[PDB]
């Protein structure tokens, strides 16, 4: 009935001279054709309303970690939601997951991005630590 | 098809001589007529099972912040869920989003509220920082 997509991390990425860390996604559950995971982004094919959810598991000791989930399309950008986690200063306590989710209208030809606003961000590749998913409503 | 609603802060409010802060909401996505935004509170028109989700982004240093999502109807009340975040002591690290959500039978005539259990809580008005939303199932 509902088209869905659940993605997990195959690989982290972070270009030199930037303060962004992105994730390379691979699907583990797919139904329907609306969405397609193209390396570091997710391409929208079928326009409609979608539940989006993102979790990231962090191990940095710096002040504050989190993620930005965005749709970019038609020469436009819109930030959909942020997850913000204050990390403590002990390495052997400095572990926190960050989860947010929401309902949004995504148009055919849009691109979805999940960015961590730090360079070389320490985060988990565990498919049950860090994930990204979609449900068409 | 599913009635939905996603709401963002227009304004913040915290009447003198009480220890509660509320949010005034405005819709940015809408489908169906089974819900309606009305200043600080959201009215339910169609009885039914709804997914209810709420994020608030805090900056206070005080111990333990969070929100209480509730329904109120027929002289009655029911706390649906709470979200509890410990804030750190250092003001520059003292940033945390708090996301919680769940599935609830909501009745026609119900007013839904989101209250931060402190007077003048420092919370974000940002549309991608603090939000509330509904999906009828």
């Amino acid at each position: 009935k509902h088209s869905v997509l659940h993605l997990v991390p195959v690989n982290i990425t972070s270009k030199a001279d930037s303060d962004v860390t992105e994730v390379m996604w691979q699907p583990v559950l797919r139904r329907g054709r609306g969405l397609e995971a193209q390396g570091d982004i997710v391409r929208v094919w079928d326009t409609g309303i979608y539940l989006l959810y993102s979790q990231v598991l962090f191990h940095d000791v710096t002040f504050t970690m989190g993620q930005v989930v965005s749709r970019e399309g038609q020469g436009r950008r819109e930030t959909l939601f942020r997850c913000i986690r204050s990390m403590p200063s002990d390495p052997d306590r400095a572990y926190n997951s960050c989860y947010s989710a929401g309902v949004f209208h995504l148009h055919q030809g849009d691109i979805i991005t999940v960015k961590i606003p730090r360079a070389n961000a320490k985060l988990s590749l565990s498919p049950h630590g860090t994930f990204l998913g979609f449900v068409k409503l | 098809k599913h009635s939905v609603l996603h709401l963002v802060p227009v304004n913040i409010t915290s009447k003198a001589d009480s220890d509660v802060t509320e949010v005034m909401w405005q819709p940015v996505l809408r489908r169906g007529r089974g819900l309606e935004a009305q200043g600080d509170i959201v009215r339910v028109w169609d009885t039914g099972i709804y997914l209810l989700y709420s994020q608030v982004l805090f900056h206070d240093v005080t111990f333990t912040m969070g929100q209480v999502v509730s329904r109120e109807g027929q002289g009655r009340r029911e706390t649906l869920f709470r979200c509890i975040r410990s804030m750190p002591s250092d003001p520059d690290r003292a940033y945390n989003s708090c996301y919680s959500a769940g599935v609830f039978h909501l009745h026609q005539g119900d007013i839904i509220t989101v209250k931060i259990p402190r007077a003048n809580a420092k919370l974000s008005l940002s549309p991608h920082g603090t939000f509330l939303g509904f999906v009828k199932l």
């Binding site: 303060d19 930005v68 942020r82 913000i84 606003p117 | 982004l57 940033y95 974000s124 940002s126 991608h128």
Partner: peptide, 16 residues
């Protein structure tokens, strides 16, 4: 900063 990127800027977290 980092959260003070213009693409997802939130005044709430840009110093004081």
């Amino acid at each position: 900063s980092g959260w003070c990127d213009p693409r997802w800027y939130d005044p709430f977290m840009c110093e004081h």
